[PDB]
Amino acid sequence: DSCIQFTRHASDVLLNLNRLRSRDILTDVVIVVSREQFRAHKTVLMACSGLFYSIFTDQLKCNLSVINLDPEINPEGFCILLDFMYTSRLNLREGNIMAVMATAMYLQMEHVVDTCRKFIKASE
Amino acid sequence: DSCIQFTRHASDVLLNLNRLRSRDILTDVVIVVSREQFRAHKTVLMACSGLFYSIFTDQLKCNLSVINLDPEINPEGFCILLDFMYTSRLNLREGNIMAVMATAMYLQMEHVVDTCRKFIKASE
């Protein structure tokens, strides 16, 4: 086509989606990770994670307002990844890298798994 | 903070949101523009438009599944802007620029109004 493109549009949309999440506006699911609960938008979760894409395209699970993750999933690891989904920023640290990688593998977030493997290989 | 950032994340999220829209997955509102209907996600509309941000933060309107636009709004103009919201690409042409600008003004999409004014000024 003969379209023009606004370079910052995608980033501005994501910034607004994060603002909506922070104010709990039109959030439609709560992700339970052991003792912790995280409110989010199903569409953003599906857009970032192979696991959530599978869950919310399921004819029964698409209607659930609560999703319970595997008890082996670390809440801090999940929190770091949920923040990444809404911001493009990953808070990767020596103290959390193993939990972040295991959570990214479970959530099926290939690019996060890739940078975790690379940061781990550099430290060995 | 000491975060790393994935450059393409925002663009990949928007691409997936557009794929969900094309397959009518978790769309939660229909925008009626005279004889035409457009299914969308409320969060994306709010993230792109001052008008939809106002509508869906309203305690009564947030719960509506149908929103009827002003009868002066051109459906093709709305379609071009809805595509822009989900893609960052604006199909701006001599034959549609006046309708696109009027629709962008109504929807409160300042950056679109700005490029329309600039393209119009260049042709006079």
């Binding site: 379209c3 023009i4 493109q5 370079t7 | 690409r89 604006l90």
Partner: peptide, 4 residues
């Protein structure tokens, strides 16, 4: 705005 750019030509993509």
């Amino acid at each position: 705005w750019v030509i993509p």
